[PDB]
Amino acid sequence: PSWPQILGRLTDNRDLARGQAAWAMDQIMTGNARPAQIAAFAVAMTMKAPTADEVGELAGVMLSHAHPLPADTVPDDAVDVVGTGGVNTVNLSTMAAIVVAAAGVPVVKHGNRAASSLSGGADTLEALGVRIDLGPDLVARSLAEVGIGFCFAPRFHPSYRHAAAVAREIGVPTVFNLLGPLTNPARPRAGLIGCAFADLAEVMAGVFAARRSSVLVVHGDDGLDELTTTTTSTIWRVAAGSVDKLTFDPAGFGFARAQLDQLAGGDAQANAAAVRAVLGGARGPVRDAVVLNAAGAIVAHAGLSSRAEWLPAWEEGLRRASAAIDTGAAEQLLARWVRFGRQI
Amino acid sequence: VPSWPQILGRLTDNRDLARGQAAWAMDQIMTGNARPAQIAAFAVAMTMKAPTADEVGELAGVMLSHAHPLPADTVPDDAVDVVGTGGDGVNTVNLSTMAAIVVAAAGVPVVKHGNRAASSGGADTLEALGVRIDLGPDLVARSLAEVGIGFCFAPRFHPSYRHAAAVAREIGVPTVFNLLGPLTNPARPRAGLIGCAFADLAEVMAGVFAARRSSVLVVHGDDGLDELTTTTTSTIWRVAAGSVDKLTFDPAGFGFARAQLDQLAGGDAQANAAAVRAVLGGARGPVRDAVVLNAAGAIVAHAGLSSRAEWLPAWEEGLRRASAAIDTGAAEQLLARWVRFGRQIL
Ligand SMILES: Nc1ccccc1C(=O)O
Ligand SMILES: Nc1ccccc1C(=O)O
Secondary structure (H helix, E strand, O other), X not given: OOHHHHHXXXXXXXXXXXXXXXXXXXXXHOOOOOHHHHHHHHHHHHHHOOOHHHHHHHHHHHHHOOOOOOOOOOOOOOEEEEEOOOOOOHHHHHHHHHHHHHOOOOEEEEXXXXXXXXXXXXXXXXXXXXXXXXXXXXXXXXXXXXOEEEEEHHHHOHHHHHHHHHHHHHOOOOHHHHHHHHOOOXXXXXXXXXXOOHHHHHHHHHHHHOOOOEEEEEEEOOOOOOOXXXXXXXXXXXXOOEEEEEEEOHHHHOOOOOOHHHOOOOOHHHHHHHHXXXXXXXXXXXXXXXXXXXXXXXXHHHHHHOOOOHHHHHHHHHHHHHHHHHXXXXXXXXXXXXXXXXXX | OOOHHHHHHHHHOOOOOOOOHHHHHHHHHHHOXXXXXXXXXXXXXXXXXXXXXXXXXXXXXXXXXXXXXXXXXXXXOOOEEEEEOOOOOOOOHHHHHHHHHHHHHOOOOEEEEEOOOOOOOOHHHHHHOOOOOOOOHHHHHHHHHHHOEEEEEHHHHOHHHHHHHHHHHHHOOOOHHHHHHHHOOOOOOOEEEEEOOOHHHHHHHHHHHHHXXXXXXXXXXXXXXXXXXXXXXXXXXXXXXXXXXEEEEOHHHHOOOOOOHHHXXXXXXXXXXXXXXXXXXXXXXXXXXXXXXXXXHHHHHHHOOOOOOOHHHHHHHHHHHHHHHHHOOHHHHHHHHHHHHHHHOO
């Protein structure tokens, strides 16, 4: 394989042969690709439209260079809650993660300080006083003692540094933005995974299907990279190596239609302020979206070893997510997470 | 307002740039302010999007504003270029070098523009023949005036393009940057035979020349050659007086035999030099035929600066003028005069 051959193939709008994405990504991860080559590849792959096989190779090679968590420290039924980027919804996924954990589902998240290739989220967490830059042993302790952990992308994926510098220099989202959810170093087997583009959502669902995974890959039909409350969403429901694609409408559960501007995030501080209000009981469109997506992560979680059917799973998910907020469990778990970070 | 996220986002979404965006990107590239990653991302995105004539005219215009000019009134008004944008992984540099010699020998001033090859080429072959290729503006002008031909060495006239050129080499694949050689000839000839390996990009190039009111034939071999082929038919965009006629072209209607592609190609410096010596020395075959065909196209384009003459008799007179330049010895002699001029510089 070679760069001229792989880039020529992509610029001719052709899918790569098996192994070529892996080769390129391995060159990128070993420091052997020049910044222009990295950029050429990211852009051409994006514009051809990557396939599920191509993205599985990129993600798999990247994972092979990553630091794992210590053996048998990630509970088997841990979940992730994340979007690949819009505008963004770090507000919504951060809050949903905290609520899911407060409902008793172990959560392991993965991200970087924005505007980053592997999703943001770390900034907002820092602004809440959470300690984001912890190493495997302590993320593991966090998970066992608080029920949630955060894997800081720069410490678990040091070899991704060359890709990430290119991603920053070019500014525009590429195929690399799909990698965050697919390269969580804790390897959770369940999750709610949002994406801003329907074709790329389907591609991610194909990657998760080939893993031992119970995941809802979600795309708001307004462009949101989470389940939306402004209209329908499309969901690629992934289990047992298959995909059940469906149109989802939260009006079915009593959610009023909101406006798009009402859901979008802000900076770290605005996001922290919003986390505090929602976890404190403030009702409105943001809470609703948080409850919707948390329930979504819970339904994905139930798919790992529950027999429960879609609608009953959703109804129980909504009840558990709401109760985690209304009982103060979410507020308390966030306080407990902050405490854990300070108590080192 | 322009930024790399804005421009790159627009291109990756398959959208044409807004007016002024391509110019801004090129100015960043030319001043050294673009990161290699931004340069590569731009070249690749623009290529897969499919550039427009407007976008390419902005790129070329900015590049030219950074170039070194030839001195005032040293370039004949009716000078021509003969060049292709790079064969589709197939070497046709030999042809355009020979055609240029033959065109100049027919009395039409020729000013070429290229680099040492695998980076437009042609310079390596000329060096192997004894031509001094790396000369400053005054000496190119004097070459044009005393010999009737000159060569603008790209690294000399376009030094601020080195950032882009390093990126183009690093990625290997052809991009929109490959269209720039013929559109940034520092002598700014107003006529030419310009070959392109891709039909869609040839048509784009013709729009840029049309906008400049150049008299050009942009040519695409229907076998993918960036030159008029004898292997099959060719598409030609006839550009004169700001408008563009697209035509099919069959060399068989002038009596030319069908050749094999493997015949019209050939490798490195010393073998290309030997092929030039043979053709100018009068050897017949497909190489001579392709040379005569392309020289004739340049002569037709040159005529288009004056006349808007009838197509077929323009070509017959061009084919005759090109054949005679060889068979009189005028072409072999012009090459000798060119080599002699270079040796007088010391
Ligand atoms: N996103 C990353 C992943 C790994 C190493 C460095 C980075 C970085 O932010 O530069
Ligand atoms: N092709 C070129 C044109 C101008 C300047 C440098 C180069 C170069 O090869 O580095």
